[PDB]
């Protein structure tokens, strides 16, 4: 009955963002310059995450050291060594006293910041995934939802250490996830050129968006909470609407041949920042399908991208052991 | 400016940076090798003759070789985590020709990868006693082949089949090192040591403004 689904999708025949938002003011050339360069790591940066306080910033690299920055003063608050050197996800709890990590070890280690003894220790480990961890995000102080490369995601419980709910309906390997602003839903983009919206409470998929033609690498909720953007290996991003259940925009260029590595949204949802495998970043307009800036400060690659919670800054990692804060 | 809390935070940051600088020497002085192969290939017994990680050193240089097998048989994505390995120890079972075709194909795919194009691959034709027993007791180009007895021609046929991809598509930034191993060969550690020595020598030639 896929033909019926495609006919229902095509029932909205007047689906052209280039016409509805044609007569709008363009954002213009966004010239963002590097403010800080956190050059403390040793090797390729794979993941990073901001805290709710909007100052502290956790990051992980290839050398197996999970470090915590202070972008205001460029000071390393903590530096947590890791058992496994291949970690590709990072997390920072909203309470700010927990940091998670994971990777090829198929374990979501959680490190207790600000303990009574003033040290960083592994508070809990979650070893229920049969594939490499791709993205872990802290739902709250007690729950964390993780997606691995074994086609399934899972919602965890810190007190018991076991999955409360699992999400097994997918194809390929899940590459990244992103929570809703209400923290009641989340989405997961995988290598099957498809992204699915999940419900945390029920543990059942609600919608599936098959618009891309290659492995989706990064996915991030819209600030409004009713959309998201998917960056894939086809060197082209897209924006999906949960209500419309259809791709809205297609941020593609003829000169772009390198796939997407990271995708993040600005505070207002007007500026879509996309990390690229083409040695730099790109700063895409959300609803104009045109570029607005290039963050070419990095000299190896771009592997992670994060926008500060109140929108005051962005942070882009690289395959060189640098971390550049832009503004 | 410089308060009591700010001075303590700066001192903590300097201590962290000193620890990072201390660990940088350890990280740079250890060579990380990725072990790759098939199920029939005896890559496990190559490690046993010295994710599952092993640690060994030859001339006080510490090598750390990794045999990851807990993944879901799809390596498009997690193979990028080994982009900075000094070498790949791709192991071939040369005594199974039907599997040798797939070994040839995935060696070609590894060689022509975008991220592994700068990583040299150490080639181990693991099963050679079995190959000698089989030949002594598929590919139409074997009849029209000349040695660069029969078991030597077969060994070098497989070696040249791998070197055809290792040469016709190589960009000059990485090389393939073919070696002939066995089940009881104990020189694999030193072979990997010397191959890594030459790999680092080539990067040093490139980075020392000599080439």
């Amino acid at each position: 009955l896929k033909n019926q689904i495609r006919d229902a999708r095509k029932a909205c025949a007047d689906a052209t963002l280039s016409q509805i938002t044609n007569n709008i003011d363009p954002v213009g050339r966004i010239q963002m310059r590097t403010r800080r360069t956190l050059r403390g790591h040793l090797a390729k940066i794979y993941a990073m995450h901001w805290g709710t306080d909007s100052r502290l910033l956790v990051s992980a690299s290839q050398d197996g050291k999970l470090i915590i920055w202070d972008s205001y003063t460029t000071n390393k608050v903590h530096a947590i060594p890791l058992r496994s050197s291949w970690v590709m996800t990072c997390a920072y709890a909203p309470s700010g006293n927990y940091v998670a990590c994971g990777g090829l070890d198929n374990i979501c280690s959680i490190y207790n910041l600000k303990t009574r003894e003033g040290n960083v220790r592994v508070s809990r480990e979650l070893a229920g995934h049969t594939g490499y961890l791709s993205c872990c995000r802290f739902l709250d102080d007690n729950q964390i939802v993780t997606s691995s490369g074994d086609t399934t995601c899972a919602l965890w419980d810190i007190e018991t250490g076991q999955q409360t709910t699992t999400f097994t309906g997918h194809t390929g390997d899940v590459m990244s996830l992103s929570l809703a602003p209400d923290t009641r839903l989340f989405v997961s983009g995988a290598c099957d050129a498809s992204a699915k919206l999940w419900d945390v409470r029920e543990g059942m998929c609600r919608q599936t968006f098959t618009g891309h033609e290659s492995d989706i690498n990064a996915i991030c909720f819209f600030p409004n909470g009713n959309a998201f953007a998917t960056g894939s290996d086809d060197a082209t991003c897209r924006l999906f609407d949960l209500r419309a259940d259809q791709e809205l925009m297609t941020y593609s260029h003829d000169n772009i041949i390198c796939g997407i590595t990271s995708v993040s949204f600005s505070k207002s949802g007007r500026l879509l920042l996309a990390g690229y495998d083409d040695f730099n970043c790109n700063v895409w307009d959300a609803l104009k399908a045109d570029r607005a800036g290039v963050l070419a400060g990095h000299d190896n690659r771009v592997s992670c991208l994060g926008v500060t919670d109140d929108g005051m800054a962005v942070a882009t990692g690289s395959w060189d052991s640098f971390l550049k804060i832009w503004n | 400016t410089l308060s009591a809390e700010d001075k303590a935070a700066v001192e903590r940051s300097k201590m962290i940076e000193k620890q990072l600088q201390k660990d940088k020497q350890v990280y740079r002085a250890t060579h990380r090798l990725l072990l790759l192969g098939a199920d029939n290939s005896g890559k496990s017994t190559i490690v046993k003759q010295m994710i599952f990680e092993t640690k060994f050193q030859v001339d006080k240089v510490n090598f750390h070789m990794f045999d990851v097998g807990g993944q879901r048989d799809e390596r498009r994505k997690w193979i990028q985590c080994f982009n900075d390995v000094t070498a790949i120890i791709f192991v071939v079972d040369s005594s199974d020709y039907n599997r040798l075709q797939e070994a040839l194909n995935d060696f070609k795919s590894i060689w022509n990868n975008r991220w592994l194009r700068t990583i040299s691959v150490i080639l181990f034709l693991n099963k050679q006693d079995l190959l000698a027993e089989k030949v002594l007791a598929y590919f139409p180009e074997f009849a029209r082949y000349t040695t660069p007895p029969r078991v030597t021609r077969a060994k070098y046929f497989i070696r040249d089949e791998f070197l055809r991809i290792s040469t016709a598509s190589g960009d000059g930034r990485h090389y393939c090192y073919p070696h002939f191993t066995c089940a009881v060969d104990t020189e694999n550690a030193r072979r990997i040591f010397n191959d890594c020595k030459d790999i680092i020598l080539q990067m040093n030639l490139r980075e020392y403004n000599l080439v």
Partner: nanobody
Amino acid sequence: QVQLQESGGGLVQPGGSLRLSCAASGFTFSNYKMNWVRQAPGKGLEWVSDISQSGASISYTGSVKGRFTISRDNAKNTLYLQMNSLKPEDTAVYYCARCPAPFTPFCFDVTSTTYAYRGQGTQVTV
């Protein structure tokens, strides 16, 4: 939505000939290189042939070269396999496959047990 569908099989004489055609939709044909996947009974997913972009590089298998012809049509958005000589040991299912990387000759995962861009092939019986 990447979809692939094959046709033209299930009737072969020993030493006979037919032609395999896989249709493609939902993705650009020219930017990707497409392989061939053979699944014999009691056997894993094998490999047959290759074509690169606009037919720049062509590769076969030792048991395939000399009797199989690989053809592709970017304008028609379909990939062809011409079968000239036959033996009764190639009775299998031909999965018309590709690799996710565009503008890159890196078909790393094509013969995997599960694969998103590998359509359901057609049975071939000699």
